[PDB]
Each structure stands twice: as C-alpha cells, then as structure tokens.
Write a protein that binds this DNA or RNA. Structure first.
Ligand code: ZN
Ligand code: ZN
Length: 161
RNA sequence: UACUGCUGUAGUGGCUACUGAAUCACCCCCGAUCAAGGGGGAACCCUAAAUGGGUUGAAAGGAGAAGUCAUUUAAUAAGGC
C-alpha cells in the first residue's frame, strides 16, 4: 500500500477556487488545513476568493500539485492565462453550463466575458430570482443559491438569451 | 462586469472670514509687536534707612537640501509590469 488521498480529477475550464473546494469537500479538509498540508500556509484560503494580489507562483502551484496530484500545467490551466484580467467579484455563473457540468468556469470571471459562447446567454452575476450574489466557487457545496435554495441548473431558464 | 434609492444638517468632520480670554515669569497700567519700551507698586536682603542699590524658575543647540525606511490613515486596484 502507498500513501493516498481522495483524489479528484479536474474538470474542463473549472476554476482553481472551485477545484480546490471540491478537493476539500471530498477530503473533509479546511483552507488552513489544505494550506498546511501543501506547505504554503493560508495562501490557499486566499485563492478561494480569487485574491491573486501576488499571482499564484510556480512554486505555490507545484506545492499544490504535490498534494492534489494534478499536473502543474493543468493547475495553471484553471488560472487566467498570463495577461488576462479577471474580476474577483462578483462571482458569475451560467446556468446551462452548470447543468451540462456542475462546476464554476474560470472563463466566467474574465473581465471581457459577458456571453456564454456555447449557449448565447448573458451569464448571471446574481441569483435571478432573489438577487442574492453567489458565494465563492470553493464554497459551492452543491448547486443552489444559499438564500433561496434554487438549483443552479434551474437558473438556466431565467437567465436572458 | 458598475451599482444605486429608502437621507434629516440628522450625526460627525474639514476649510475660510470675522470675532471671546489669557498676550505672562514677583504684581499693575499705557505701548509697540518686520518693533519699544516707558512708568507705577509689593515682598525680601544689603542698607539704621535713601524707586539709594540689588533678588522675587531653569536648561540645549548643526543647519539646509534630496532621497529612503517604518507606522498609521485615505483612495484606488483585483496584480503590477
Ligand atoms: Zn453556458
Ligand atoms: Zn437565490
């Protein structure tokens, strides 16, 4: 037998925040706990809210790669590519893309993205029924608005075309 | 993708202008303050006594200029290049 963890395979276009949240919820860890295990401290707790004041470094991502067992390049593929500007707030979601695959796309957080290219829908910045801003992607235990308990996949037919 | 209203000077701040008091070193009065001192008293000592004269709290100085660090505050940003 060899040391192991509840590994999670990353999605396509998922966020670093959402992937780390899924990794934590499948390992019953905590942001401080994940950081301490990785060896980088509370920096992880920062990444879950997209505060990349000092962009996630190559070392700070290799240390994560050692723990979550995902290749460092595959890790960088959930951060915005070098030079692309993202908004850490508000957290934005497309209902149809969540119904297709239950994840949060880092591409939704780009400053330049307002339309889902494969759904032709104006992506959502707040819950379309109760105007409740979405939580951090790592905090999505499941696909529902916290205040109104409306499933994320449902919101697809409330969001405008 | 930004976010707003539910807000009365209402609370709390800042700035300017005119104003209230002290404007002193023992006390009081008149005066200047980019200049200015003048006068009038008290107490004590000396002095028998003479505004006779004296005393009526002490210290220290290397400045200018330019950067930098630190702390705090505030605005902005979601990295910055
Ligand atoms: Zn979509
Ligand atoms: Zn809601």
């Amino acid at each position: 037998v060899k040391p192991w963890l509840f590994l999670i395979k990353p999605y396509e276009g998922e966020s670093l925040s959402h992937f780390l949240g899924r990794f934590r919820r499948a390992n019953h860890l905590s942001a401080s706990g994940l950081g301490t295990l990785a060896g980088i401290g509370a920096i992880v707790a920062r990444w879950e809210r997209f505060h990349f004041n000092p962009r996630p470094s190559q070392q700070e991502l290799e240390a994560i790669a050692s723990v979550v067992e995902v290749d460092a390049q595959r890790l960088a593929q959930m951060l915005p590519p070098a030079g692309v500007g993202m908004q850490h707030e508000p957290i934005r979601l497309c209902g149809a893309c969540y119904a297709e695959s239950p994840c949060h796309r880092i591409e939704w957080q780009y400053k330049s993205v307002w339309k889902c290219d494969r759904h032709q829908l104006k992506i959502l910045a707040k819950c379309p029924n109760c105007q409740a801003p979405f939580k951090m992607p790592a905090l999505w235990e499941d696909g529902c608005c916290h205040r109104c308990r409306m499933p994320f996949a449902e919101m697809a037919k409330l969001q405008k075309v």
